[PDB]
Design an enzyme around this catalytic site. Structure first.
Site, short mmCIF file in Angstrom:
data_model
loop_
_atom_site.label_atom_id
_atom_site.label_comp_id
_atom_site.label_asym_id
_atom_site.label_seq_id
_atom_site.Cartn_x
_atom_site.Cartn_y
_atom_site.Cartn_z
N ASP D 45 0.81 -1.21 0.00
CA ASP D 45 0.00 0.00 0.00
C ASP D 45 0.85 1.27 0.00
O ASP D 45 0.44 2.29 -0.57
CB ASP D 45 -1.00 0.00 1.15
N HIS D 223 1.64 9.18 3.73
CA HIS D 223 3.00 8.93 4.22
C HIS D 223 3.79 10.21 4.54
O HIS D 223 4.68 10.21 5.40
CB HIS D 223 3.80 8.04 3.26
N1 LIG Z 1 -6.19 1.88 3.43
C1 LIG Z 1 -5.51 1.05 4.22
N2 LIG Z 1 -6.16 0.13 4.96
C2 LIG Z 1 -5.51 -0.70 5.76
N3 LIG Z 1 -4.19 -0.67 5.87
C3 LIG Z 1 -3.48 0.22 5.16
C4 LIG Z 1 -4.12 1.11 4.31
N4 LIG Z 1 -3.18 1.86 3.73
C5 LIG Z 1 -2.00 1.47 4.20
N5 LIG Z 1 -2.18 0.46 5.07
C6 LIG Z 1 -1.12 -0.26 5.82
O1 LIG Z 1 -0.32 0.71 6.55
C7 LIG Z 1 1.01 0.14 6.74
C8 LIG Z 1 2.09 1.18 6.34
S1 LIG Z 1 1.64 2.29 4.94
S2 LIG Z 1 2.64 4.03 5.31
C9 LIG Z 1 1.36 5.33 5.55
C10 LIG Z 1 0.09 4.86 6.27
O2 LIG Z 1 0.42 4.35 7.56
C11 LIG Z 1 -0.82 4.38 8.31
N6 LIG Z 1 -0.56 4.51 9.77
C12 LIG Z 1 0.31 5.31 10.40
N7 LIG Z 1 0.22 5.10 11.72
C13 LIG Z 1 -0.71 4.17 11.93
C14 LIG Z 1 -1.25 3.54 13.05
N8 LIG Z 1 -0.84 3.82 14.30
N9 LIG Z 1 -2.20 2.61 12.86
C15 LIG Z 1 -2.63 2.27 11.66
N10 LIG Z 1 -2.16 2.85 10.57
C16 LIG Z 1 -1.20 3.79 10.69
C17 LIG Z 1 -1.59 5.60 7.81
O3 LIG Z 1 -2.90 5.20 7.40
C18 LIG Z 1 -0.76 6.08 6.61
O4 LIG Z 1 -1.59 6.44 5.51
C19 LIG Z 1 1.06 -1.13 5.87
O5 LIG Z 1 0.89 -2.29 6.69
C20 LIG Z 1 -0.13 -0.96 4.91
O6 LIG Z 1 -0.65 -2.23 4.50
#
Ligand SMILES: Nc1ncnc2c1ncn2[C@@H]1O[C@H](CSSC[C@H]2O[C@@H](n3cnc4c(N)ncnc43)[C@H](O)[C@@H]2O)[C@@H](O)[C@H]1O
Ligand SMILES: Nc1ncnc2c1ncn2[C@@H]1O[C@H](CSSC[C@H]2O[C@@H](n3cnc4c(N)ncnc43)[C@H](O)[C@@H]2O)[C@@H](O)[C@H]1O
Ligand SMILES: Nc1ncnc2c1ncn2[C@@H]1O[C@H](CSSC[C@H]2O[C@@H](n3cnc4c(N)ncnc43)[C@H](O)[C@@H]2O)[C@@H](O)[C@H]1O
Ligand SMILES: Nc1ncnc2c1ncn2[C@@H]1O[C@H](CSSC[C@H]2O[C@@H](n3cnc4c(N)ncnc43)[C@H](O)[C@@H]2O)[C@@H](O)[C@H]1O
Lengths: 264, 264, 264, 264
Positions: D45, D223
């Site tokens: 992603d 990001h």
């Molecule tokens: N749309 C979506 N759904 C589920 N998971 C996602 C999605 N987009 C990215 N990811 C997951 O985030 C992880 C790193 S992507 S780097 C940027 C994203 O990190 C995410 N992020 C940052 N901190 C957290 C925390 N604390 N919890 C969940 N997600 C977080 C946030 O949505 C940012 O847009 C990786 O496992 C991806 O599969």
């Protein structure tokens, strides 16, 4: 008895401090901010936290007292209008001491390093230097979880009403010798798993955080926040040391919680 | 040593029970389900809970052991393939006892009433007879909050992984002598206020629920659920009584939590 | 215009109703509780909910208005002191209509059965007849999860500030045509898994609950709660029907939320 | 059709990219990373998020497709073993487009300033430069709350499974044109109050954050994370712009959520 008074530093707190000093001048009762036996804090919990950290090498010798110029005194005990009564009671030695548990944090580095050790009255937290935050959580030498998310918070009992509370942690009576670990925004999916729930550890249990990537962490100890580089381990345990409060009158912890969160 | 074995009652558990009895027949080691010193439970946690409540008047005299025919044994200790080794170890008296805290519930009525008293290994909960649920929460005789919502749950330390966990409560190590109160769907608006957070109480603290309207409540004690009418008070405190487990080998609580929620 | 007035039934609400009727007597403006075009509710949200369910077969023909004799009017619009101004404005037809989405619940039985269909303004919930609650959650014919816990709640947008809120659901602006599903005390361990999070469904999505064991369920639709036996399916979707409100003046949803939860 | 392929950059993704380029060489089908009509992302992603931000000035002209070399593809659609079938289907134009809502963030400064505008596919968050975080939350020009805590997160519908989920937000079907605001560690006591709950806003609603102290903020857009100084306002609204995906076959959002959080 030797005493000192810290002030928040606004007009209200400074004048209150000066009046208490003048009041103490009529007793015995010497002002000494090097080796005090009583530390009075006038301000909010922030002022009280600073007073504690000012004297953390003398905790066994000091009884703390707080006067709040807020709203909001979890470590106050006293209103400004009651300051004269407090001078009087404190001079006569009309008080029994109450002790609360503290949290020991050990930060171990690579090369050398140290071994930095910190004492917290509220909590210690860990976050990344920004940075995805990923750590292995090890409890008494057994690998418990790989934590991914924003960070982790380890709280004392008296700390549970602070940062711990905002993160969904339980409020714990300070007679219980424990620390509580809460998650900040944990990632949970089919591949990444954390416990979810806050965890409450007794004395002598050791919780160790070990870097997975990424050995740089922003670590807070109460108000203090420092960037630590080349971390090998962060280690938490209930301290052998305790903070002592001077009381004075009954003001039960649960009433303090009621007054602070429900109504006053 | 006198022992008995309860079974879940499916083919698997019954045959395991019969084999253990046959195995115990080669030692000494008498089957007695009136005054046993060892109670073996074969099934899941439900079976174990029933065994405990079967013998709650003899808790000081009994050491409990669980074999799980699940998935899921927080009160197991043992897999069915290990039953022979367990027969052997139990016959030789190769075990040290471990005690967990219990919860006392007192239900007081009007007229008479009683004073019904219950002992819980996991938790006691209170809900309305349906019915808006409204109670005054009183901690050591001080009014703490008026609770409105679905109900309340009071958990033991070992209970914290059960209903307590689902309600957002903290997991607590069972060496801590405490009970934990969690909310079910609390109402919070400008006029109605609850603490929100789970609350952890030490020994000797008493939490009392007093009806506001509505004196009819559905009260659960572990698996048992009863409609109580004309209630004046529901009272919670850490019991003076404890459950004793027979162990055997190291299987730390945190590893048990890891195996049950993270991975096995 | 034909109108009727429901009252909470206390002295305050009855007298207010009588005065409004007298006031309407000076206009035209006929009292008719069989085929009203305006339904005025005097009381709280409970009174308003009853008024809605009184007239659910005539929703396309009615504009609703609420006067609150609380504290707490999410479906009020009006204070009792403003009743004269309301009589005046309503008689002159000085109002634009606002529509909120509703929730359709279909309960299908075995043998026959039915097919009972309900309309909710706040929410429909499902719990066991007590009873472990276990259902398969099916979204647009795809198996999504096996839910174990206390129950499930399906909320309308205007319902999101009610039961939904207590269960950790999101508040949704009522211009969004959706329903929201929240969990009550879900069980999550290594073997049992639910999504955890509230789920927000658009129009035309169908959420179906199918029994696993246990075909008896306690089903609520707003204030109404009924024990249904021999259930084969419970089916949720955003209704094609809408509730119409008469307004009058700007009182935005977010201000209504502010006034109800933050301060007024 | 003009296309380009971004790669995560490990051996696996690069070789897959080279093979797809070779495969596309047998059709028509020109590689162009300046003005592509199809953007293929090979990685996770994160790779997909970078591809989106690479081409955010051409969103109306591009259909996106993701191949995941994980675990974990919410913006994949495709496994690496299916790459040949994808080359074939994409060359034949055998696909219908699907659009997801995006979030517009406007950051206004003092002096000048700007007015920086950002587009997010997942979310935008705001935290302090460290720093207590305190902001006034203004919804459509009405003051809603003073927020104190760690920060705030504004999510798109497709973003709800990401950071939003970790913070207790609802999962929303991406056919709903909305944004969702969640709290990070809010402070709630007798003097400080926030809504608690996530908030879901329709199109055309504007949420504005205004500094109380402290005009320096760390702002993330997916990001990207940037320290902004001398901020007067941060403004959120559902973008008029949309991301377009190329599909191909049915893979419903709820099944995608099931596969990612429940089991696959
Ligand atoms: N749309 C979506 N759904 C589920 N998971 C996602 C999605 N987009 C990215 N990811 C997951 O985030 C992880 C790193 S992507 S780097 C940027 C994203 O990190 C995410 N992020 C940052 N901190 C957290 C925390 N604390 N919890 C969940 N997600 C977080 C946030 O949505 C940012 O847009 C990786 O496992 C991806 O599969
Ligand atoms: N012990 C305790 N209980 C309740 N409230 C407390 C306590 N100690 C301090 N405070 C309150 O924290 C506020 C600022 S003190 S500066 C350091 C503390 O800030 C606290 N902090 C930092 N971030 C947060 C968040 N996000 N939520 C709650 N508390 C937080 C943390 O516990 C630190 O020890 C002020 O309103 C105090 O009355
Ligand atoms: N101590 C403990 N930890 C974890 N899991 C446990 C424990 N005791 C029982 N269980 C599990 O509860 C399930 C049924 S036991 S019947 C009585 C217990 O049910 C529990 N219960 C009832 N409703 C719920 C909900 N909603 N969530 C979690 N647990 C619940 C409650 O703790 C009662 O003591 C089964 O999977 C057991 O492995
Ligand atoms: N729409 C709405 N928003 C906020 N508050 C509402 C709403 N509708 C009713 N109410 C309030 O519910 C209270 C009793 S109305 S009787 C039926 C409603 O009770 C509500 N209910 C039932 N159990 C709970 C719980 N546990 N928490 C919150 N709400 C609950 C549910 O939404 C039902 O539709 C009263 O204070 C009303 O002001």
């Amino acid at each position: 008895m030797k005493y000192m008074i810290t002030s928040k530093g606004d007009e209200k707190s400074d004048l209150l401090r000066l009046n208490m000093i003048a009041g103490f001048g009529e007793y015995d009762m010497e002002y000494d901010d090097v080796e005090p036996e009583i530390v009075i804090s006038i301000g909010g919990d922030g002022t009280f936290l600073s007073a504690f950290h000012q004297y953390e090498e003398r905790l066994d010798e000091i009884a703390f007292i707080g006067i709040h110029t807020g709203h909001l005194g979890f470590y106050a005990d006293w209103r400004p209008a009651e300051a004269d009564k407090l001078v009087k009671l404190l001079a006569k030695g009309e008080y029994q001491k109450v002790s609360y548990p503290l949290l020991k944090t050990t930060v171990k580095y690579g090369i050398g390093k140290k071994e930095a050790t910190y004492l917290a009255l509220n909590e210690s937290t860990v976050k990344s230097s920004g940075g995805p935050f990923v750590v292995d959580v090890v409890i008494n030498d057994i690998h418990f979880e790989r934590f991914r998310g924003d960070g982790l918070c380890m709280s004392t009992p008296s700390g549970t009403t602070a940062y711990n509370k905002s993160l969904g942690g339980a409020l714990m009576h300070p007679s219980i010798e424990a620390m509580q670990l809460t998650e900040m925004a944990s990632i949970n999916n089919r591949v990444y798993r954390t416990i979810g729930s806050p965890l409450v550890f007794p004395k002598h249990h050791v919780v160790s955080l070990q870097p997975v990537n990424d050995k740089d962490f922003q670590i807070s100890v109460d108000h203090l926040s420092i960037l630590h580089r080349d971390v090998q381990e962060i280690r938490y345990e209930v301290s052998a040391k305790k903070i002592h409060f001077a009381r004075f009158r009954s003001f039960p912890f649960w009433r303090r919680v009621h007054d602070s969160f429900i109504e006053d």
